Amino acid sequence: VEAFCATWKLTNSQNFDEYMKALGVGFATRQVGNVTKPTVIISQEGDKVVIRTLSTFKNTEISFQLGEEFDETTADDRNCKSVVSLDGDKLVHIQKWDGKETNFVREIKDGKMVMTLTFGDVVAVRHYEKA
């Protein structure tokens, strides 16, 4: 987890538009999700782990304890029951709403943070570089 503690900037993403289409996110929000390069701040603040995503179209922010379910209102406005946890060396984020489930895997790869987002059989990848 200390490995993920830093300010990160999106440097590249692939197939993110289709992943969003699957999630059922509206046209107005995907346009925004396609041209924005968010700054993701991950840190440990006291007892919890905080994940802040800064964008000029939306500023989110989810604080939690590993292994503990919590409520989350996503950028595309889906109220989910989420859980963030460590699986060996990867940070796994799982979101559950309307009988559905999508998950994000964040892992450190050759200097960078690789984020794999998957929904059913649809996969999207995002690369992050430290500030």
Ligand X SMILES: CC/C=C\C/C=C\C/C=C\C/C=C\C/C=C\C/C=C\CCC(=O)O
In angstroms, what is the minimal distance from the CB of 89 to ligand X?
A: 18
Contacts 24+ apart (CB under 8 A), 54-59: 57/32, 58/32
Read off the tokens for 21. Answer: 């289409």
What's 64's DSSP letter? E
Is residue 4 a contact residue for ligand X (CB under 6 A)? no
93 is in an annotated binding site: no
Give the CA count within 13 Å in the CB-facing half-sphere of 61.
9
- The 47-86 contact track toward ligand X, x by CB under 6 A, reads ------x-x--x-x-x---------x-xxx----------
In angstroms, what is the minimal distance from the CB of 41 to ligand X?
A: 10
Residues in region 7-36 near ligand X by CB under 6 A: 10, 20, 25, 29, 32-33, 36
Phi, psi of 111 (to 5 degrees): 95, -35
Annotated binding site: 126-128
Which residue ranges make up the annotated binding site for a fatty acid?
126-128
